[PDB]
Amino acid sequence: SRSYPCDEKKQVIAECSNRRLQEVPQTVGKYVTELDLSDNFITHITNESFQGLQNLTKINLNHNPNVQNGLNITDGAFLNLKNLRELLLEDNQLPQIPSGLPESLTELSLIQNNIYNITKEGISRLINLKNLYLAWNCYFNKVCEKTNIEDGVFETLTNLELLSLSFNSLSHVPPKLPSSLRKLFLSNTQIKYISEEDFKGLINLTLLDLSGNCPRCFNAPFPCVPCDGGASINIDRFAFQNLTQLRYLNLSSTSLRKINAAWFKNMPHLKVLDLEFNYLVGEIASGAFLTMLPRLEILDLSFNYIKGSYPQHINISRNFSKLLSLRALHLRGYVFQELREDDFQPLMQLPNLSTINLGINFIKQIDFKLFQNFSNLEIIYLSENRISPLVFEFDPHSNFYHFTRPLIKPQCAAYGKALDLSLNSIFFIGPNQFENLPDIACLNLSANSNAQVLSGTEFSAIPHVKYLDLTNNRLDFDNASALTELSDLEVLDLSYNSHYFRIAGVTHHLEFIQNFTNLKVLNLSHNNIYTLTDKYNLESKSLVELVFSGNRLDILWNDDDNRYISIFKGLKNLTRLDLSLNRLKHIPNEAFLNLPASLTELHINDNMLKFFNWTLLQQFPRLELLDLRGNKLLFLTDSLSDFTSSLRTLLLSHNRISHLPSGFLSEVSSLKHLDLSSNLLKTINKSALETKTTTKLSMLELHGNPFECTCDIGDFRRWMDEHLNVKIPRLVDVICASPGDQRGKSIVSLE
Amino acid sequence: SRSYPCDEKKQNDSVIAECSNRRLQEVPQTVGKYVTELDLSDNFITHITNESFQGLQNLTKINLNHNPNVGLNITDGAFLNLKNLRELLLEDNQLPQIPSGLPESLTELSLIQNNIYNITKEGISRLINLKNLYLAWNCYFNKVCEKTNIEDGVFETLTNLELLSLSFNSLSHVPPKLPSSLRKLFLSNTQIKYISEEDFKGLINLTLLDLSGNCPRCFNAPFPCVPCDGGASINIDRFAFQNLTQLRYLNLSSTSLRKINAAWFKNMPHLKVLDLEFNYLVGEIASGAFLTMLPRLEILDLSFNYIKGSYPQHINISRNFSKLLSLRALHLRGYVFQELREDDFQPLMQLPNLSTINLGINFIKQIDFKLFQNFSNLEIIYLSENRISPLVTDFEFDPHSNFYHFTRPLIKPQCAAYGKALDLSLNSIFFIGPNQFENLPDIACLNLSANSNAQVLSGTEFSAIPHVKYLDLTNNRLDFDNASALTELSDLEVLDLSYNSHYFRIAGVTHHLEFIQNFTNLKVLNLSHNNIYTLTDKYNLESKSLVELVFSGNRLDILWNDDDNRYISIFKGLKNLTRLDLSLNRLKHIPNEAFLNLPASLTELHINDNMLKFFNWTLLQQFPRLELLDLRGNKLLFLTDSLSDFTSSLRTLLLSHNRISHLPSGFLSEVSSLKHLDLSSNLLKTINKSALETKTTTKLSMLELHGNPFECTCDIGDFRRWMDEHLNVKIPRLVDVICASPGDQRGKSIVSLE
Ligand SMILES: *[C@@H]1O[C@H](CO)[C@@H](O[C@@H]2O[C@H](CO)[C@@H](O[C@@H]3O[C@H](CO)[C@@H](O)[C@H](O[C@H]4O[C@H](CO)[C@@H](O)[C@H](O)[C@@H]4O)[C@@H]3O)[C@H](O)[C@H]2NC(C)=O)[C@H](O)[C@H]1NC(C)=O
Ligand SMILES: *[C@@H]1O[C@H](CO)[C@@H](O[C@@H]2O[C@H](CO)[C@@H](O[C@@H]3O[C@H](CO)[C@@H](O)[C@H](O)[C@@H]3O)[C@H](O)[C@H]2NC(C)=O)[C@H](O)[C@H]1NC(C)=O
Ligand SMILES: *[C@@H]1O[C@H](CO)[C@@H](O[C@@H]2O[C@H](CO)[C@@H](O[C@@H]3O[C@H](CO)[C@@H](O)[C@H](O)[C@@H]3O)[C@H](O)[C@H]2NC(C)=O)[C@H](O)[C@H]1NC(C)=O
Ligand SMILES: *[C@@H]1O[C@H](CO)[C@@H](O[C@@H]2O[C@H](CO)[C@@H](O)[C@H](O)[C@H]2NC(C)=O)[C@H](O)[C@H]1NC(C)=O
Ligand SMILES: *[C@@H]1O[C@H](CO)[C@@H](O[C@@H]2O[C@H](CO)[C@@H](O)[C@H](O)[C@H]2NC(C)=O)[C@H](O)[C@H]1NC(C)=O
Ligand SMILES: CCCCc1nc2c(N)nc3ccccc3c2o1
Ligand SMILES: CCCCc1nc2c(N)nc3ccccc3c2o1
Ligand SMILES: *[C@@H]1O[C@H](CO)[C@@H](O)[C@H](O)[C@H]1NC(C)=O
Ligand SMILES: *[C@@H]1O[C@H](CO)[C@@H](O)[C@H](O)[C@H]1NC(C)=O
Ligand SMILES: *[C@@H]1O[C@H](CO)[C@@H](O)[C@H](O)[C@H]1NC(C)=O
Ligand SMILES: *[C@@H]1O[C@H](CO)[C@@H](O)[C@H](O)[C@H]1NC(C)=O
Ligand SMILES: *[C@@H]1O[C@H](CO)[C@@H](O)[C@H](O)[C@H]1NC(C)=O
Ligand SMILES: *[C@@H]1O[C@H](CO)[C@@H](O)[C@H](O)[C@H]1NC(C)=O
Ligand SMILES: *[C@@H]1O[C@H](CO)[C@@H](O)[C@H](O)[C@H]1NC(C)=O
Ligand SMILES: *[C@@H]1O[C@H](CO)[C@@H](O)[C@H](O)[C@H]1NC(C)=O
Ligand SMILES: *[C@@H]1O[C@H](CO)[C@@H](O)[C@H](O)[C@H]1NC(C)=O
Ligand SMILES: *[C@@H]1O[C@H](CO)[C@@H](O)[C@H](O)[C@H]1NC(C)=O
Ligand SMILES: *[C@@H]1O[C@H](CO)[C@@H](O)[C@H](O)[C@H]1NC(C)=O
The missing domain is CATH 3.80.10.10 (Ribonuclease Inhibitor)
Known part of the structure; x- marks a missing residue:
């Protein structure tokens, strides 16, 4: 068996995504434990869809159906899958949590659906859940309803460690959250107030995300709804009193002007604090809270600029000198003209401050010698300033407030x-x-x-x-x-x-x-x-x-x-x-x-080459990869082995080759990877298959050739059958061009 | 009928068959008999014989340039029988010799870009009607070629010749015995180091002389360039131009001139355009006695006369520039200087017609801008590519263009x-x-x-x-x-x-x-x-x-x-x-x-080169003036079947490079305004009769269909008959309206199926 339509892989996973599948194929190997059916045109899941696949521990049905309109999953469609641990159902336009999900589930993703009701009936049976993602169901100007969370729905999930409810209209933190929680995401949930009770019992929490509640909306790149008067989030003095294990706190875009030092009194481990997109210029100058964070390693104060204000200098409080563990300080978008050596004195004895980020501040001059007086900077990031000569469009799995790529x-x-x-x-x-x-x-x-x-x-x-x-x-x-x-x-x-x-x-x-x-x-x-x-x-x-x-x-x-x-x-x-x-x-x-x-x-791709002198590979005895993709070549030499014994990869995609010469698949013993993608091949002839011995050939690409699926294709089809060690990727794209009754179908699918 | 493989054009006097760039291997035997001009350039034609144009006696002009693409073999006298042939273009054909037995009717012959090194009486001297002869670019640069042999007197019998172009060949001297009917003589890049009193003594009708690139200035050349011994100047005798009283154009670009003899211009009272680019004339520009001799000059090009490695503070323009009373344009690119002050251009300031001043590429760092007002009437102040700061065919060189600069408007x-x-x-x-x-x-x-x-x-x-x-x-x-x-x-x-x-x-x-x-x-x-x-x-x-x-x-x-x-x-x-x-x-x-x-x-409205999968046709109902909708380069599959319900204004619909596989019955029914429908490069296998069918006939004048994978079974019959019953609808590029299937038809035009 050469498997189809999926590609199977044992690091056992069936990669079956992005293949224009209309239904769950009934041709999946029974030894498959993980099935990726994302990005196809699948419209129905029933209890028939995966029967005879009970080894499945993981199913990905994300982004189905695409294009030409929601995913229809019957009550209990997955119930019979005794081993199902992980079910990904993102971007499927689901109107409800599907009913009768298996109790074996430990990981369930319903990101990006139309789910406005979180019910006991959906969820409270799922006692083995460790990670539950319900984010991005109702946000921005989408037409959707406020989220109804059935009281106590989460209470029976006593193994739950991660809950993500971000980008839904919630209005308050739900009560009766299980105390097993480690990570709680409530970004952009329209919660204006945090009470003493809301997280009182979550003693194992290491991450809390409250970003985007009471957002700072000026110049937002998305539809943004401020709290009345653009007011600040309201967080009770004792809201974090039991959160002794918190390592990550995201309060980005909560319109904060004032930070209550007492919020950090019981957070001796806090490691990453995100305070981007607030109004903290005054706190940065005079921040008592900085005195409460001697284990903090990453502090992000980006885009706290005052609108319309272009001050001469940045004003850093002397209290920054208490951030003894600080490794990275992000100060993008504060907006200031000149950086003087004195302005950064409070940072200069921090032993581990490695990264300073001053991107996008419209800085016009810098006293560069100041950087030497720091303990040990390794990244001095000044991109996008004014220094002159000295004299769905948001990835729901990424950070929403900045890029996370290296600086x-x-x-x-x-x-x-x-x-x-x-x-x-x-x-x-x-x-x-x-x-x-x-x-x-x-x-x-x-x-x-x-x-x-x-x-x-x-x-x-x-x-x-x-x-x-x-x-x-x-x-x-x-x-x-x-x-x-x-x-x-x-x-x-x-x-x-x-x-x-x-x-x-x-x-x-x-x-x-x-x-x-x-x-x-x-x-x-x-x-x-x-x-x-x-x-x-x-x-x-x-x-x-x-x-x-x-x-x-x-x-x-x-x-x-x-x-x-x-x-x-x-x-x-x-x-x-x-x-x-x-x-x-x-x-x-x-x-x-x-x-x-x-x-x-040697790459010579994306030229306009009409000829290539193959004989000249005789002068290149070390040549392993030759890339001639994206040219206008028609002629393959029929004595390649006379000219190279080194070549391992030959890339010939997007050329005009219509004929493979005698024994060419076996010409060069060293050749592992031949790419003949997107050429003008109608068939592969018997003589093309003739081999004196065997070959090192591991991978042959052929998708996008106009194959003639008459009985002339028989020989190659029988060759494919007898050389299962030669991988041909993307078989759904190795397509009959002619004749009309075969057109569009894989060459593998031919009687 | 509908002609093939060429596209015909009924022009004026002329009827032109545009037949170029069609992958033709033979001169087609399907050219209309009323055709007077035939363009066969850029095909794969390898042989011309006396049968090639047998049925085509009306031909006044033949273009065989650039054949075969991927040398052209022309039998002795292949064209002889064409009694009316006036113009023959045979450029870039790798010809080793002038073809033999050319018709005497010829008035225009181009052999530009071949391997012709012998210019013989036998090739040429019978061609008494020649007015323009182009033999340029046969031996130049590092091409492997030989010095050009010009048979003594070969040109003498061409007493109606007005234009002769011998540029980019190794000549060494001006040929003797040129006919005095010459108006334009091009001898650029011909390795001539010396011009004598005799060389142009009889050419009294000359209005253009090009002697550029003889003793070239080679420093930093963008081509292989061979200087005269010592990088010496061209040597032009004092009386070399004494009889050239009608000269309007003189090109002495890149002749390594340091010194210009004013007397060269004594008998040239009409001179209008003088090219002196790529010389060593910084000193003449400061002094220039010759400027006194040119009161009808309109265009003076002094570009790239820079001193190597020199970056002076100021440009030094002689006071004699004030004698150039007719000057319209002054080109001073690449002199190289730091600052332009108001005094430096005083000599230019009362020239009444000086409209254009070009100072491109001088690395100028500052300009006293007020100077431009004190000119009589500048309309183009060209300062592109300087250091001004805040105030405090295949051809590398187109043989039919100017070699020393671009000719686009500034x-x-x-x-x-x-x-x-x-x-x-x-x-x-x-x-x-x-x-x-x-x-x-x-x-x-x-x-x-x-x-x-x-x-x-x-x-x-x-x-x-x-x-x-x-x-x-x-x-x-x-x-x-x-x-x-x-x-x-x-x-x-x-x-x-x-x-x-x-x-x-x-x-x-x-x-x-x-x-x-x-x-x-x-x-x-x-x-x-x-x-x-x-x-x-x-x-x-x-x-x-x-x-x-x-x-x-x-x-x-x-x-x-x-x-x-x-x-x-x-x-x-x-x-x-x-x-x-x-x-x-x-x-x-x-x-x-x-x-x-x-x-x-x-x-x-253009929405081309997006990734559209959907287009809502019904919304064209709100766009009652919409004449052109361009949706090329998208991923569209579906065409509406009731386009006439949604627009009565649309004249052009461009749908090229999409994924349309079906034309709905009856697309185009009642959409009378549509003139131009472009369905090239889609996924069409056929067109049904009712897909095109119309009851009230349409304004449809152009339908494009090339690059569709047509199935040339008998299923294509209906469209073929439709084509034949609507000869008023142009379908361009029929050689590219190709069968994809089945195997015996693949590659052939659909019009070419029985
Ligand atoms: C508020 O701040 C907190 C940090 O204090 C921030 O929490 C981080 O959120 C991101 C956003 O999802 C998490 O990043 C993801 O982490 C998971 C789990 O390990 C990864 O699987 C993700 O993988 C990437 O690559 C995958 C390849 O399969 C892709 O599938 C995917 O697109 C991703 O590229 C991804 O890294 C991150 O782990 C947390 N941080 C912690 C400590 O948990 C939160 O996002 C901030 N709030 C907002 C609204 O931005
Ligand atoms: C100029 O060319 C250099 C050299 O090729 C470019 O840098 C190189 O970019 C490649 C990818 O384009 C980097 O290779 C990648 O490395 C990662 C991680 O090691 C790997 O995952 C990828 O598959 C790939 O191997 C390569 O390391 C990098 N080299 C260096 C020295 O930085 C550079 O991007 C080019 N500049 C521009 C503007 O394009
Ligand atoms: C910015 O957009 C403008 C407006 O479209 C572009 O200028 C315009 O360019 C087109 C050529 O694409 C000009 O039309 C052409 O005019 C010539 C001469 O009449 C005609 O031969 C062509 O078929 C075509 O009609 C149009 O005149 C011109 N309009 C102007 C200058 O006002 C401009 O080029 C764009 N800029 C950039 C950087 O792309
Ligand atoms: C130098 O700075 C440039 C500009 O910031 C960096 O270029 C960006 O780099 C990534 C490549 O990883 C791209 O995705 C962005 O598009 C780039 N932006 C621009 C405007 O070019 C570049 O990588 C930096 N170089 C180094 C060595 O870090
Ligand atoms: C202004 O200057 C720029 C640069 O010289 C011009 O851009 C050129 O335009 C020409 C003709 O349209 C192009 O072929 C060139 O490639 C362009 N040069 C460059 C560097 O881009 C632009 O045409 C000029 N604008 C006006 C109105 O004349
Ligand atoms: C961090 C960017 C905050 C909003 C902002 N946009 C701009 C902007 N576009 N230009 C600026 C120029 C000088 C100083 C501040 C500018 C500015 O500030
Ligand atoms: C018209 C330019 C002639 C040759 C030349 N190349 C350069 C060059 N590349 N840079 C220059 C910088 C300053 C001054 C003159 C420069 C120069 O001159
Ligand atoms: C635009 O800039 C000018 C600077 O002259 C300033 O006076 C004006 O207030 C600015 N207008 C706006 C709307 O920012
Ligand atoms: C520009 O446009 C609007 C016209 O409605 C007006 O409010 C504004 O003041 C105008 N500004 C200037 C500088 O003319
Ligand atoms: C700084 O970093 C090193 C390890 O990377 C560490 O041992 C030391 O404890 C850190 N210092 C502070 C002050 O946190
Ligand atoms: C390939 O290379 C050599 C010239 O170096 C020549 O002998 C051989 O004919 C070449 N093939 C082609 C098509 O030029
Ligand atoms: C050649 O490259 C190798 C690998 O980078 C390096 O070891 C060697 O030093 C280089 N040789 C020379 C002469 O610089
Ligand atoms: C071509 O020339 C030869 C004389 O060599 C003659 O035999 C033949 O008939 C000519 N053909 C035509 C079509 O004139
Ligand atoms: C390069 O620049 C230095 C001055 O910076 C100069 O000394 C040297 O001559 C230069 N090299 C050349 C070849 O001009
Ligand atoms: C650079 O290399 C050249 C030639 O190899 C040598 O003449 C020159 O002095 C070198 N200079 C430096 C500074 O590396
Ligand atoms: C300037 O140009 C005008 C219009 O072309 C013309 O009538 C006049 O003779 C010209 N002046 C000079 C001095 O050539
Ligand atoms: C096209 O928009 C029209 C408005 O006339 C609407 O009636 C129709 O639903 C649209 N079709 C689609 C598929 O969006
Ligand atoms: C509308 O555009 C045209 C330019 O064709 C102009 O005549 C008319 O004045 C413009 N209308 C207004 C109100 O500017």
């Missing part, structure tokens, strides 16, 4: 201390710009509209930069000594610096590249490179990877010009080369033969 | 049409301060594109030039945080804010587009590629005057998210709008109420 690309941060000055106005780097900074290893200058001629001295005060990002500037590469002060540079990103490269009449100089002794990775992408001055060749003894996408090799290698015929030959250590998006119609033979013999990976 | 004609133009694009005007625009003329057309401007415009910045009518602010970083922005510009008709994403992208900063309603005369607004998905307080765009809104490249998918009502009327307040562009907004579906709030005034 600094991990590959750069991995080198050491990081200074991110991206998206500023440092248009010219002058002699003292970088004076008195720490030993920066990772420097981001992307998008500073820098148009200068770097000349070998600009980075002299931080000469150990290992990863330099200069993307999206207007750099004028007119000096052979550029960047050469950076002896230890390993990664250099010059992508999107077209501005001068595109003008023929100005001089262009890339000779500095050869100076670096440790340069491993160079990205020259999207620079429109088509002409250089005097020195035509790129050279480096160390470089391993060159990204040359989005340039004009079609010009450089024009048949009437010899000058660039060795452009990459001097990159003597290169193993990875990217020549995508260079508008190539053909590569002269001599040009191809002058690519480095060291290559293991 | 200023977009739509902007220039309004009046005086100041182009400050691609500079460093990052902040517009209070006096930036002091002392300027009455600018009507203002380009500030790509100045990395990040400021909050606030209603006073353009106070000193308040009659700007066309404002280009594209590709900046503008922070639209003030409702009075640009409102000082009362007469503004066209405003381009494209590519100012920078702050629109950030949810947490405020965004304000309210200023738009203030303009009384605003007609065209372009907000493209701004990533607009959230505004502050005022969610709606309003204008009583605006006729055209370009909103492509924003996030209407977000603005019109089903859980948000706030932007449901975003465009309704554009009460005068007729053209709306919603392309590239990632839309999967448009809420019905949102669609219905688009202005009732629309005549043209």
